[PDB]
A paper describes a structure:
Nanoviruses are plant multipartite viruses with a genome composed of six to eight circular single-stranded DNA segments. Segment S encodes the capsid protein (CP) that assembles into virus particles, which encapsidate individually single DNA segments. The distinct genome segments are encapsidated individually in icosahedral particles that measure ≈18 nm in diameter. Here, we address this question by reporting a structural characterisation of the FBNSV particles at quasi-atomic resolution (3.2 Å) by cryogenic-electron-microscopy (cryo-EM) single-particle analysis.
Image processing of the best resolved 3D classes enabled us to compute a 3D map of the FBNSV electron scattering density—with imposed icosahedral symmetry—(Electron Microscopy Data Bank entry EMD-10097) from 5,156 non-binned (1.21 Å/pixel) selected particles at an average resolution of 3.2 Å. The highly positively-charged N-terminal stretch (residues 1 to 26) of the CP, which is predicted to be dynamically flexible and likely buried within the genetic material at the interior of the viral particles, is not visible in the reconstructed density and thus not included in the deposited atomic model. The CP fold is a typical wedge-shaped jelly-roll domain—the most prevalent fold among viral CPs —composed by two packed, four-stranded, anti-parallel β-sheets (named BIDG and CHEF according to classic labelling of jelly-roll β-strands using letters B through I). Each jelly-roll subunit is oriented so that the lateral sides of two β-strands (F and G) face the capsid interior and the closest fivefold axis, while the two strands (B and C) on the opposite side of the jelly-roll contribute to the outer surface of the capsid. The CP subunits interact with each other most extensively at the interfaces generated by the icosahedral fivefold symmetry axes (subunit-subunit interface area: 950 Å2), where the BIDG sheet of each subunit is tightly packed against part of the CHEF sheet and the intervening EF connection of an adjacent subunit. Fewer interactions are observed at the twofold interfaces (interface area: 393 Å2). These involve loops at the base of the wedge, including the two serines (residues 87 and 88) at the beginning of the EF connection. The fewest contacts between subunits are found at the threefold interfaces (interface area: 301 Å2) and involve the first visible residues of the N-terminal stretch, which appear to emerge from the capsid interior, the adjacent C-terminal stretch, which points towards the capsid interior, and two loops at the base of the jelly-roll wedge. Though less resolved (>4.5 Å) than the density of the surrounding protein layer, the residual genome density is comparably strong in the neighbourhoods of the CP-CP fivefold interfaces, where a putative aromatic base—sandwiched between the BIDG and CHEF sheets of neighbouring CP subunits—protrudes towards the main-chain atoms of residues 102 to 104 of the EF connection.
Residue numbers in the entry:
A (entry chain A), B (entry chain A), C (entry chain A), D (entry chain A), E (entry chain A), F (entry chain A), ...: 27 to 172
Write the structure that this text describes.
């Protein structure tokens, strides 16, 4: 009975080799006071044809500026300093099984069902460690309550 | 007890690189007044060996002319302008893990079970975002009630 | 328990003889992300004293630009092209039983109870076919959930 | 579960003073093999401002050519020759309470719910006795099963 | 299981200003020995545009010749001399809200359901007091058991 | 509740002595997408007054061109090559007990009740082996669901 | 308790680019009067390293000579002419994700459990559309009742 | 109710071709007296694009120095000398389906749920047999009770 709206926000990010990098998935700012219930994210990263992109999808309050200081580099393990600060709700890994120099274009889709919502003060993040310079076009349809 | 007929319509489409492009799946026009209950679509796209084809299968009334204005480009997210206009019932993604310059020929099959039918005034669409020029030969066996 | 607000929007329209003409009833734009639950519309059309105003109140997604291409002229029948596109929830007819040249001022009121709401992506319309140039002052108190 | 379609057919008829005149309400001929379940007819007759239009809505097989030989003139009574031939399912009367010489434009609407359908071999008729030359624009949305 | 027949008898009567005037509704005489169960009468009186026609529908044995001596003039009250002689089963009133000198044509319809029949020895009457010279075309479909 | 239609198709066939000959019973082609539920066939063969006409009524998919290669000559036995291809649902035999040279005119009627319908892709056949040149006028009222 | 025998029949077929081609899976002919209950087929097609082999496994009576006239080319959709003639019981698709010019050797295995058997008059087919010249070595262990 | 802590320890190991090599997964030594309940390990081995890494995850007391003397070389089978000494709780295999000389970077993730804990005297090991020189960056989030 709550008035739901499924808004779509995209986020383009060209990121370097070992950069653990996170993007907040949230409505476009013109909707404040929301409450994210479901997220359908589909990030289609163009990447080098031998490497991998290990992604995590984490609910946390207190928005994280530095990413390497909260997630470990070669695969996204939540460090114990931000252990209970950061709650993992999504995982995954996109490996490029392609050719020598023809860069692949692989996508991960994930339909996260957030239990008891994520408000505008909390932050739903998608963080990723790649192994080459990738060209993520990460967009997401959030299912907010406003 | 309703008189069912499983008709087969094919649709060839050579489409360019970032073209979000949709085809209506429907009987051949000689059958008006139908009611699509099940669709078995099998699109065998010949495509470049590094790219992907992200497809959506959407039930909507009010036939969509412009596709980029209703679905986002790099993966098919239903924009909030056409949010409740367009109902997603099928998803998927076909990635080309092949060679440098030998173009692959990959197919997606999908047996959509449409709840409470899709009449001739509604429109069942299959829309797809590719990442290179693909040669889709999308055909489909619909299971109409006439 | 949902925070309700009853906002009032007016819409003045002087429309010609056989013009099937529709106005969207919606909040004033400063409230996006609403959900219309009840509408009390009261349109007081000043009209010529021999004619009639046949009105329909229709819930539809996909906002209709051309009105004659979706509703028939002499009384508002939903054409079969937009058959399941357009859902009728209100009807009525205001006839002018007056004098030779003294133009009457007659009003229709309608308290539509919209089942399961009408969001900001759907469009609640009031469409009307008149038979002379009328001077509708159609205002409406919507009962949105924001 | 039967595939329903709501088609709209209009019928313009300018008819003279005491002409008992009937129009078959049926789909447009391009749909044969139908089965009419519901009819929403709305006839907006422009008429002289002192007279009346007494209409009947009758289900009958065996399509009636001569109308005065089956219905009585000053109000539509089914004559005993066609007594069980013709089944009344709708009645009504539109009186013009207007001015001396300013012709009114009055409409009757009727949502007939036909029990157990009306097939294409039966004929649903709307017959009317007027008392002046009227300009009926009788249209109707039938709810056929094909 | 009784053999029913719905016969139609019309009765034209041009009657003067304050004439309380009654017509027997009955089959055409070629059917004796009937038993009237239902009557659908529809009298379309053309009348002067300021006056009224107050009608009563009365079951009585002993056919009434003089009408003013059994019903009062300005509205049809059954006088106490013929109090239990005359049983009222239908009432009504047709008022002419029209113009100065353009005579209206207004009709009353009444579907009387006679309890336990009216035989050919009883008399079902429709009596009316007008207030100007009217041009009643009173016809009726009776539902006799023969 | 399915819209039924009882259409009548006739088929004239003058066939020779030992010709096992079959006619498809089906609607006239203007109705595609049907579903035959009941068939009332009545074939009135004029025949020589000493011979017999042994007929079979068979439901089969895959329309049979050659008849002797599926049914045996002197009485219609379904050969084992088309054993499960052809399902017998009607039998019979019309013998001519007449005169030396006065050719009789004998008819067989059969009201086949097809279980779970026969669609337009299946074929209901009536096949017959005669013993002289007969003049069959085989007509049939099918009871299709369209 | 029925005497079962699991016989093995192989079928070598080198077939061209867009050839929809079908092989009957059946015992070797020395066993007539069988009843196929289970089939374990394993076809190891050597094929070009970019293409696909879309196969269908279909139970039908009336053995099909022409394959393109019953199945559509780019993916095996059963055409509506042979709609109820041909019953699909197995599907699948073998894609070659290999190298430029080193031809792969990929196999599909399928253990079809045929409900209520397939006799020697019916025909169990495996039909396949390839996209290059393939070298199928399709063999199958059928589980007949004789 | 036991005080849980999820600590993250990484272990980099560049290991040669047929080296069965094991790493103890354990907290960093500053936490003694722990009790490992859950382990989320994610090892992202960069490896040659034709080979495989077969890994085992084994709970054992008595820390193993020599690895080839407890696990067999070409796939990790627990030898019968250390049969009940070593308890397997995790398995898996990472194959490199890539290119000629472009080394892939593939990861295995495993969320081991250790029944009744693993204390600091026991040793949870992850052992792996590769087939080329790999560059494992094996890190792990253990879920200890201190």
């Amino acid at each position: 009975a709550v008035p739901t709206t499924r808004v779509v926000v995209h986020q383009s990010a060209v990121l370097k080799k070992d950069d653990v990098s996170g993007s907040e998935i949230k409505p476009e700012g013109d909707v404040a006071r929301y409450k994210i219930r479901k997220v359908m994210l589909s990030c289609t990263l163009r990447m080098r044809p031998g490497e991998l992109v290990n992604y995590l999808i984490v609910k946390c309050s207190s928005p994280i500026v530095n990413w390497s200081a909260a997630f470990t580099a070669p695969a996204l393990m939540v460090k114990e300093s931000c252990q209970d600060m950061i709650t993992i709700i999504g995982k995954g890994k996109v490996e490029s099984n392609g050719v020598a120099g023809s860069d692949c274009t692989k996508s991960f889709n994930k339909f996260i069902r957030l239990g008891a919502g994520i408000s505008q003060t909390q932050h739903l993040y998608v963080v990723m460690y790649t192994s080459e310079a990738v060209k993520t076009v990460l967009e997401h349809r959030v299912y907010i309550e406003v």
